[PDB]
Every structure is written in C-alpha cells, then in structure tokens.
Design a protein around this ligand. Sequence first.
Ligand SMILES: CC(C)(C)c1ccc(N2CCN(S(=O)(=O)Nc3ccc(SCCC(=O)Nc4ccccc4)cc3C(=O)O)CC2)cc1
Ligand SMILES: c1ccc(-c2ccccc2)cc1
Length: 150
Amino acid sequence: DELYRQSLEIISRYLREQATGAKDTKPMGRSGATSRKALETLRRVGDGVQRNHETAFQGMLRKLDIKNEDDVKSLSRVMIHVFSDGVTNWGRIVTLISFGAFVAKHLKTINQESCIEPLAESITDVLVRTKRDWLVKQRGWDGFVEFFHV
Ligand SMILES: CC(C)(C)c1ccc(N2CCN(S(=O)(=O)Nc3ccc(SCCC(=O)Nc4ccccc4)cc3C(=O)O)CC2)cc1
Ligand SMILES: c1ccc(-c2ccccc2)cc1
C-alpha cells in the first residue's frame, strides 16, 4: 500500500535524522517531492512541538520506559486503541510523530539505535491503521504540507 510506504518513508527518515543529526541522502520513492516538503515541515513543526512540550514528552517517555523491540510491540497494540478515540486533526498526528522522534533520540542515547526502524514502523502502523480514511480525505502528505505552510 502506497500511503503506508510514503508515510513510513517520511516518518523513518524524520526519526532517524533527529536521533543521529545526519540527513539521509538515499533516493525517495514516487511522491519524493512531497516527502521532502513533509520532512522540511517536520523539521520546523516537529522540532517546535518537542521544544514547547518538552516536560510532557519527558513525563510520557519516563512512564513508558521504552527500551527494546518487545516494548515497542506491546505499546503499539494498546496505542492503536488509544489513538482511535477522540478527534482527529493534523495537530494530533504531528504530535504522535514528534513524540516518536523524542523517543528515537532517547533510544540512540541508551545504545538502542537498532530499535528506531521498528519504532518508525509502529508509529506508521498506529497512524495508518487508525487514520487511513481521514488521511486520504485530507489530501495525504500534500494536505499535511499545506496545513503547516509558512
Ligand atoms: C510507537 C509507540 C511506541 C507504540 C507509541 C505510540 C503512541 C504513543 N502515545 C500516544 C500518542 N501520543 S501523542 O502525544 O501523540 N498524543 C497523545 C498524548 C497524550 C494523550 S492524553 C491521554 C493519554 C492517557 O493518559 N490515556 C489513558 C491513561 C490510562 C488508561 C487509559 C488511557 C493522548 C494522546 C492521543 O493522541 O491519544 C504520544 C504517546 C507512544 C508510543
Ligand atoms: C484525543 C484526541 C486528540 C488528542 C491530542 C491532541 C493534540 C496533541 C496530542 C493529542 C488527544 C486525545
């Protein structure tokens, strides 16, 4: 599925870039022009959310204590249910991705870099399994870039 593949492309690249401090220069797939604009957006908005909500993110990180792939697996099963409840908006979706980047930075600190790709997959699974129809209706990643346009 195309939407899953493009979402994972953006989400995995943003989480790994936040954790390592280096950009991925490997080519993107079809819709690469949109994925580059989505990453430019996440570098502005996602970095901003992590800074402005640092104390809440630290509290959530400390309580969840994600330190391995099994932790990511267990948490993704419950978060598919939690993320399905309540209103859907681009603010909620960028906060999920921003929290993923916050966790990815912590995983690099505890020498668990190998857990960033499964984390990006679970973030993508949570997002696409619960919001597929909303994402499609809101013009997908083009809609995301348009909503946060400066
Ligand atoms: C990849 C994986 C490791 C699986 C993963 C996936 C998701 C997350 N979650 C969820 C998404 N957020 S959010 O900040 O985007 N958004 C939220 C943050 C907070 C809240 S307040 C209410 C949560 C609560 O206390 N429920 C609660 C408390 C006790 C019992 C039952 C329910 C709700 C949301 C929201 O979107 O529903 C971050 C934390 C973490 C890790
Ligand atoms: C239900 C619906 C939306 C949110 C939410 C909104 C903004 C940022 C993070 C989560 C939480 C619970």
